[PDB]
Amino acid sequence: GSLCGDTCFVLGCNDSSCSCNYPICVKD
């Protein structure tokens, strides 16, 4: 329910729980 920190717009989310909510990834 917060930002993962990384971005999926470049390559992809690092954490498996982080969804590709372009541009930034989010988890929980």
Curated annotation (Swiss-Prot):
Signal peptide: none annotated. One of its GO terms (biological process) is defense response. This is a cyclic peptide. The keyword Disulfide bond applies. The keyword Disulfide bond applies. Disulfide bonds join C4-C18, C8-C20, C13-C25. It comes from the Eukaryota. Keywords: Disulfide bond, Knottin, Plant defense. There is a cross-link at G1-D28 (Cyclopeptide (Gly-Asp)). Belongs to the cyclotide family. Moebius subfamily. The presence of a 'disulfide through disulfide knot' structurally defines this protein as a knottin. Probably participates in a plant defense mechanism. This is Kalata-B12. It comes from Oldenlandia affinis.
